[PDB]
Design a protein around this nucleic acid. Structure first.
Ligand SMILES: CN[C@@H]1[C@@H](O)[C@@H](O[C@@H]2[C@@H](O)[C@H](O[C@H]3O[C@H]([C@@H](C)O)[C@@H](O)[C@H](O)[C@H]3N)[C@@H](N)C[C@H]2N)OC[C@]1(C)O
Ligand SMILES: CN[C@@H]1[C@@H](O)[C@@H](O[C@@H]2[C@@H](O)[C@H](O[C@H]3O[C@H]([C@@H](C)O)[C@@H](O)[C@H](O)[C@H]3N)[C@@H](N)C[C@H]2N)OC[C@]1(C)O
Ligand SMILES: CN[C@@H]1[C@@H](O)[C@@H](O[C@@H]2[C@@H](O)[C@H](O[C@H]3O[C@H]([C@@H](C)O)[C@@H](O)[C@H](O)[C@H]3N)[C@@H](N)C[C@H]2N)OC[C@]1(C)O
Ligand SMILES: [Zn+2]
Lengths: 249, 91
RNA sequence: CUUGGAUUUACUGAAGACUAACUACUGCGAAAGCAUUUACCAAGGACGUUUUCAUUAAUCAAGAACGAAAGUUAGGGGAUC
RNA sequence: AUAACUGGCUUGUGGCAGUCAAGCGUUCAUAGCGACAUUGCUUUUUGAUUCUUCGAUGUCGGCUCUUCCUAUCAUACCGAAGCAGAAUUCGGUAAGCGUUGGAUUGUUCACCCACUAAUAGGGAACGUGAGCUGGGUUUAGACCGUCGUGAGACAGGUUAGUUU
RNA sequence: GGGUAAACGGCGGGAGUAACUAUGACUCUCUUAAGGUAGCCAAAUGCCUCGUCAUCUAAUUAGUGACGCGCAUGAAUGGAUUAACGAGAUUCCCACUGUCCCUAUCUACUAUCUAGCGAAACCACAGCCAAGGGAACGGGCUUGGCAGAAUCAGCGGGGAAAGAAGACCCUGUUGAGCUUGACUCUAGUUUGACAUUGUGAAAAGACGUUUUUUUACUUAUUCAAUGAAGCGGAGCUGGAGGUCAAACUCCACGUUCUAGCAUUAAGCC
RNA sequence: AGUGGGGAAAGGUUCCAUGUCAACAGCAGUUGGACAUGGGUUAGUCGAUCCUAAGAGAUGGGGAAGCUCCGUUUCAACGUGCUUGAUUUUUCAGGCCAACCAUCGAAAGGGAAUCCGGUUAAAAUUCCGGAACUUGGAUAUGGAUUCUUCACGGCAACGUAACUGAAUGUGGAGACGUCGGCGUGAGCCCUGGGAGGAGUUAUCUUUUCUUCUUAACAGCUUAUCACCCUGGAAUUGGUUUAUCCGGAGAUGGGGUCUUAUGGCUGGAAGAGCGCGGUAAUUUUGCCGCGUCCGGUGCGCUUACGACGGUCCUUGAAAAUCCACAGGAAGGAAUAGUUUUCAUGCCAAGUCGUACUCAUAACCGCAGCAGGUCUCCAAGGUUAACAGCCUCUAGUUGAUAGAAUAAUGUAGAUAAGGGAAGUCGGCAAAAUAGAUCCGUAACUUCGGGAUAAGGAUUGGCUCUAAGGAUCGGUAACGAUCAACUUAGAACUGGUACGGACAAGGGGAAUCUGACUGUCUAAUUAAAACAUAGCAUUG
RNA sequence: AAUAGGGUGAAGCCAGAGGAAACUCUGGUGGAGGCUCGUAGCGGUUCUGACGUGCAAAUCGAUCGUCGAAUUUGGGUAUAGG
C-alpha cells in the first residue's frame, strides 16, 4: 500500500501550524527573586484577539528589577480582567482575579488558570476559553497541592507552582453551532491543515486500512491495539470500550 | 411592522441548516450583538469586538468576558467565591 | 458477593438528594402548594382607628396570570430509588 | 493445439410431412378427426463437436432498402363435405400481387387496442454499424441486496459512460 | 477471569389448536449469544415475477397507491420522514412545435470546373459473375455465363477494406497492483539479563563474605530555567509564645484606593 | 469589456534606413518579422541595487564509514564595538555598553528625490530648453540666542524664522481585512454667450463640426473630524439617508489644529493651440492677432473623508525617519552658540533602458481558430461596462476566378394534425422586458413565488405633483434648475419590450439536506466534502 | 491583483393604531445572506452537433452550471518516487 495521511502529518511539511498572525506565546513571568519572596506589580495595556485561539490575551507591562527597562508580558486573560488593571504576581500577591499566586497560598476551592505543572515552566494547565483548575486540598508537610483538571483528572503539584486567579475568558464558544462548511474553513485557516477530512472507508485499499470493498465498510474491528505500528493505528486506538455512553461515569 | 414572527436575527439564514440549529443560533446571536452597561462609566456602550473581548465606545475600556455575553455564570460565581475566600483568609 | 476476606467494627473523607422526631381534626396561600438556621427584598389576611374618598360595587362571554406529578429541549449534575 | 459469433458436419431437441387404423363422428374406421406404433423431411430452435478465424471477419435490437423461398394469411380459378341458403371446414394449381396503425418492454419474443381482403412463416455472414442509432450487452465512476475475515464475487438489481 | 456493539458483526425451526370451511388469538417441543423490535417495502434491495388488487390509457413488462412467511428490508454497517435546493433517475398533464403522417422550398459555404499549390492511409500479385470442390463462404483453381479503348460525377454491396503482434478466453513452471488466520521474514515497539554503575542503613535468607525487599546519599547520568541575579547557612531588627534563668520556640522582616514617576547614588566616616 | 494606447513573464535585434527576391511567407510577390549592409537603447530623481515575508542557509558544535545530515531563541571566552579631551608622538587616555543582529529571500509588498515644452529614420520622466527637488559633505554671511545665560506670546486648545541637550528609556510613523450607503474633489460627459476656422445650402437650420490649454515646484489661504474657553440643561434638547450624543457638561456663543482638497499669485505665455501674412528651388523659418466669460448633475470613473455592518475569520515583517522623557557636559557681558531660520558652495557611482507582448516577435515541432498576468475607456439606446449603431485610433489580413447538380455543414419557413416519431420530446418550438392585478398544496414560518394565471405598453399635443437660493398669516414675490411619476385629448391597416435584448409551466415518485468538490483527454453523479451527531486516545 | 446591472428585503431605528390589561397590529427606514436573476470571470451539462490523415495529440458552435465567496488568479515558497 501507500503511506497514509496519519503518517504524512509527522513530516511537518504542509501540516505545520499557521503562525504568521499569532500575537506571541502566552506564558507567565519567569520565576525571579520578586515573585519568590514578595510580589511585583504590572499594568494591563491591551486585551487582544489571538488568531487560532479562542481565549483573549493580555499584554501586561512590568518594571525590570535590575535595570532601567520595561518588560512586556503575554498572559492569558481571565474573565473580568480589564485594560488599566494592576496585576500582582508573587508569593505575597492578594487573592484577586488576575493575580498570579503559588498554589500553596490559595485556600480550598480556589479557581485558578494557566497553572504550572512544574515550578517555573510558566503555565501548562487550564489555558483554553472557559476552562480553569480547582484547588482540592493541601499537603503542607510534603509541599504538594492537589488540583482538579478540566478533563476531570486529579493531580498532585508542587505548592510552589503558580497559577492565575479566575476563569479563562471567552467561555462558551462551542455553544453556538458553526452551521457552515465555510465557518470551519475560516476556523482552520489560522490553525493548521486538518480540514476537510476524507473518510477512510471512502478511499481505496492503498490509501487506508479502511479502504476498498464493494460496499463501504471497515471489515475488521476498528479498535486497534496500543502496540500496533504506524500505518495500522486508524480508528479507535486502545479503546477500553465503545458505543453510546449511558448512565454516569 | 413585525417583519418576522420568530426567526428574528437568523432571518439572514433563510430556510437552511434546520430550524433547531437556527433557533440555537438566535439565542446566542442576540446576546452577541447586544449593547451592555459599562461598569466603569455607567453607559450602555459595551459591545463585543471578538470572542472574550468587550469594548466601551465611551470610556474606551476593554474587559475580558465570555464568547457571546460580557459575563458568564461561572465567572460571576468565581468573583463571589474569590471574594469570600479573600476575607476568610485575611480576616 | 465472598480466604483476592464478603458481611460486621472504628476514624477520616467525597457526592448528590431529603428536611425525620417536634407535627396536631393546627397555620398560610387564588389554586397548584408551602416545614433546618440566619439576613435582605417586596407582598398579604385579620384586628385596632372619633383618619381619608364617596358608589368608585357584584357576577362575568371575549381576552389574560398561575397551575402537582408524569412528559419535551439544551447545559450542569447524576447519591438514592 | 482452446472457449465466447457466423459458417461446415450432425439433427437428439425444435419445426414440418407420411404409413397403419383402436376409437370419435346420431348408425359410419378414413366428410372431418385419429390412440398404440412406425417411416421420413427441414436447418427458420437449442444442443453436440472444435474444422476455419485470437500480428482482431466490429459482437443485441430497431430504423432503412432490395431480393429470394413456399411449408399460401389474402386476392384468381377449381375439386370435397356430416356443402339447402348464408357462413365454415378439407384439398389442388398457384409466390403474379399484398400482408398495416398503436399502448408497455432495449428487447427477438410476449400481450392487449384498432383497422383491414389479410394482418402467413422464413432466408440472404442469426442480410444490412467506413448506412445510422446506441436503449441493452460488455472496460474504467457510483449505489443496494446476498456472499466473503478481507481484497473482492454475483446469466442479481440500479445510475453515468468518445461509435474513427 | 471480568468489561465492551454510535467495535467488526449477528438477530431460528417443527407439530397441534376456535360449533360450515378457512385461518389460528392459544398449546407443546427442538434449539440460540440473541433469535429482526420500531418502522419500511416487488423500493436504486423480491429470484419466482410482466407478484396480486386499484388507478392512470382505446390498449400500459412503464408510473403511482395498496398488500406482504421479505430468494436476500430494517435501525449512526444508521431506520422512517422531510420544507428548500438539483445541467441527478423516472411517470403523467397543459403549452408548443417538421419528431412524425410526408415531405416540399429558400440562403451562405463546400462539393463541382479552372489558374497556382499540393500531401497521406494503404499496396504479394491483382481486380466481372454462377456453381463445384477446397483450411468446410474464391479475384485466381474446375465447369459454365461471357468478354471491346479512354473515361467523369456520385455511391457505400464486396475487397471476410484500413487502423492495433485480441484488451475477452486458455496456455506459460511470465509478471505486477491489492488482501489475508498462506510460506519466510522485517522497521518499530515491549519484556529480561549484562555493561554504563558509585557510597550507606534496616530487616528477611546461606555458607567474614553473599541472594531478596524497602529506603538513605550525590558526584555519574536524565529533565527543566536563565542576559547563569540574589542559593545555602549564620547573624542584626522587631512581633507573638509568660518567660524564670535567660534569651528558649515560631513568624516577619521596606512595594496594593488611581493606566504617573523610578536610569547615569545622595549622605556619612 | 477594441482589431485602440502601454506594460509584467518569455524572446533577443525581430526595432530603423538603404538595398535586395535563390530559399521562406502551403496562390503570388516589385512586399515582409525573409535575405544583405549599416545605424540605433544617454538617468542623482524610473527600476535594480537596500529591507524583511513564507522560507533558504554558513558558523563552536552533535550524528554519519562517508558523499554529507541535524541545529540558526542553536549547552560557545563569538565587538574585524561606540563616544570623548585631545594628541599627532599616527601613539594615548578614559568612559559607555554588547538582550538582538553571518548571509540569502519581492523589477506587484516596504522604500530619499522631477516636471513641462521641444527634439530622431529609429532613444527619451534619460537628450535640448527652462523650471525644481533629495541625499551626503563643506562652509561663509545675515538673522536668532546670551548681563534673568540655553527665546517669547496665548486662560486654553496651541502659535512662531530660529530658540543647547550625552548615556539611557519610551512613543509615533513605516503598518495593513472586507462590505454598505452618504459627502467632497479631480478627469471625463453635457451645456449658454463670445472670438476664429471648416461644412451644408433647391429650402431651412441665431445653424452641423472644430480651437479657446496650464505641470512639478514656492508663497498666502482653504476642512470633515478632533480639541479648547464660556455657560449649566425636563416643557429633554441637538442631530444622520442610516439613532446616536449630553451634569464624565448637551443646545447656544467664541476660538485652536491636521492641509486631504480647492482658490489666488509666482512657474507662465516667453510655452502649447487656433487663425492670417511673408522671404524662398532654401538649411530652418519670421511676423501679426487671439487664446475670454459662465451653467448643470441619484451622470461615468477614480481619489479622499466622516460613518455603519461583519467574523468560533479580527485581517505581515523589517530596514528607515521623527518625537518625547532624562539631565551628562558645555556654555555669559563688552561674549559662548546653531548648518532643525534664510541665503551661498561641492558632489551623486554600477547595471537595465531598442522592439514584440500576440488570429505572425512568448509556449504549443509552424506566421497553429489552443494557452498566457494587468492599467486607461467617448456619443446614442438601456437597469446595464449586455446587445445594436457611431466618433478618435487601427485594420481592410485569411489563394483567387467561373458556375450554383446530388449528398453534406450552418441557418430558415411550411397547409391540416399535434409526440401518432423515438429507448427517451433528442433536436426544435413555445415563454421572456417593464407597469398593474392575481397567486394553491405544503412549510423548518425563513419560504414555496416571477407559483399558477390575466390586463397594459407606439406616436403626438397637453396637464398635474415632487425642489434650490435670495428678500421682513414669508401660507408670499423674485431668480434658477435634474428627470421621475401620474393623468387626459388626439391619432394609425389593432400597431407599439415593433431591431436588440429576454423564465415555459403544473401534479408526483426515487435519491442526496443545502452552497461547495473530483476522474486535464469517454463517467459531474445518488460519488466526495459539509454543518450536526457519536465513539476513541 | 480582480469581480456590470437588477431582485428579495434579516437585525437595529422612527412614527401611528388597537386593547381593561397581558399584549397585538400597521406604514416607513435600514441594507443582512457560503440568498437570488444575470454580465466579465471561473467551470463544463447536452446536442451523444462540427471536426475526427483536425485550426487543435482534446479544438470549434450552440445549449448550459456558477457568478461576493469553501470565489478567481500572477509571482514567491515548501513537499520527490513505495
Ligand atoms: C405495428 N404493430 C404491431 C402489431 O400489429 C402486432 O403485430 C403482429 C405481429 O407481431 C404478429 O407476429 C408475431 O406473432 C406471430 C404468430 C401470431 O404466428 C409470430 O409467428 C411472429 O414471429 C411474431 N412476430 C403477426 N402475426 C400479426 C401482426 N399484427 O404486434 C406487434 C406490433 C409492433 O405492435
Ligand atoms: C550531564 N551533563 C550535562 C550536559 O548534558 C548538558 O546538559 C544539557 C543542557 O545544557 C540542555 O539545556 C541547554 O540547552 C537547551 C537547548 C537544547 O534548547 C537550552 O534551551 C537551555 O537553555 C540550555 N540550558 C538540556 N536541554 C539538556 C541537557 N542534557 O549541560 C549540562 C551538563 C551537566 O554538563
Ligand atoms: C510490493 N513490491 C514492490 C516491487 O514490485 C517493486 O516496485 C516497482 C518499483 O520499484 C518500480 O520503480 C523503480 O523504477 C522506476 C522507473 C525508473 O522505472 C523508478 O521511478 C523508481 O524509483 C524505482 N523504484 C516500478 N517501475 C514498478 C514497481 N512494481 O519495488 C519493491 C516494492 C516497492 O516493494
Ligand atoms: Zn465605559
Amino acid at each position: 500500500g501507500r503511506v497514509i495521511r496519519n503518517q504524512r502529518k509527522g513530516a511537518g511539511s504542509i501540516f505545520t501550524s499557521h503562525t504568521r498572525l499569532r500575537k506571541g506565546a502566552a506564558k507567565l513571568r519567569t520565576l525571579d527573586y520578586a515573585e519568590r519572596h514578595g510580589y511585583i506589580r504590572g499594568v494591563v495595556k491591551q486585551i487582544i484577539h489571538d488568531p487560532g485561539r479562542g481565549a483573549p490575551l493580555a499584554k501586561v507591562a512590568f518594571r525590570d528589577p535590575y535595570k532601567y527597562k520595561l518588560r512586556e508580558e503575554t498572559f492569558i486573560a481571565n474573565e473580568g480582567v480589564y485594560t488599566g488593571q494592576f496585576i500582582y504576581a508573587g508569593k505575597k500577591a492578594s487573592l484577586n482575579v488576575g493575580n498570579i499566586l503559588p498554589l500553596g497560598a490559595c485556600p480550598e476551592g480556589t479557581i485558578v488558570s494557566n497553572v504550572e505543572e512544574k515550578v517555573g515552566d510558566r503555565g501548562a494547565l487550564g489555558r483554553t476559553s472557559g476552562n480553569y483548575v480547582i484547588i482540592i486540598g493541601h499537603n503542607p508537610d510534603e509541599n504538594k497541592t492537589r488540583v482538579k483538571l478540566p478533563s476531570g483528572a486529579k493531580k498532585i503539584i508542587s505548592s510552589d507552582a503558580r497559577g492565575v486567579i479566575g476563569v479563562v475568558a471567552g467561555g462558551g464558544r462551542i455553544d453556538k453551532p458553526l452551521l457552515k462548511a465555510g465557518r470551519a474553513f475560516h476556523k482552520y485557516k489560522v490553525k493548521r491543515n486538518s480540514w476537510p477530512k476524507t473518510r477512510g472507508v471512502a478511499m481505496n485499499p492503498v490509501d487506508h486500512p479502511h479502504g476498498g470493498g464493494n460496499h463501504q465498510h471497515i471489515g475488521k474491528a476498528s479498535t486497534i491495539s496500543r502496540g500496533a505500528v504506524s500505518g495500522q493505528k486508524a480508528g479507535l486506538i486502545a479503546a477500553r470500550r465503545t458505543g453510546l455512553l449511558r448512565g454516569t461515569q | 411592522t413585525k417583519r418576522t414572527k420568530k426567526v428574528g436575527i437568523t432571518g439572514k439564514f433563510g430556510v437552511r441548516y434546520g430550524s433547531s440549529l437556527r433557533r440555537q443560533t438566535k439565542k446566542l446571536e442576540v446576546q452577541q450583538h447586544a449593547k451592555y452597561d459599562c461598569s466603569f462609566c455607567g453607559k450602555r456602550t459595551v459591545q463585543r469586538g471578538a470572542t472574550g473581548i468587550w469594548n466601551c465606545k465611551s470610556c474606551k475600556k476593554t474587559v475580558a468576558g465570555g464568547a457571546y455575553t460580557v459575563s458568564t455564570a461561572a465567572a460571576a460565581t468565581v468573583r463571589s467565591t474569590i471574594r469570600r475566600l479573600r476575607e476568610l483568609a485575611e480576616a
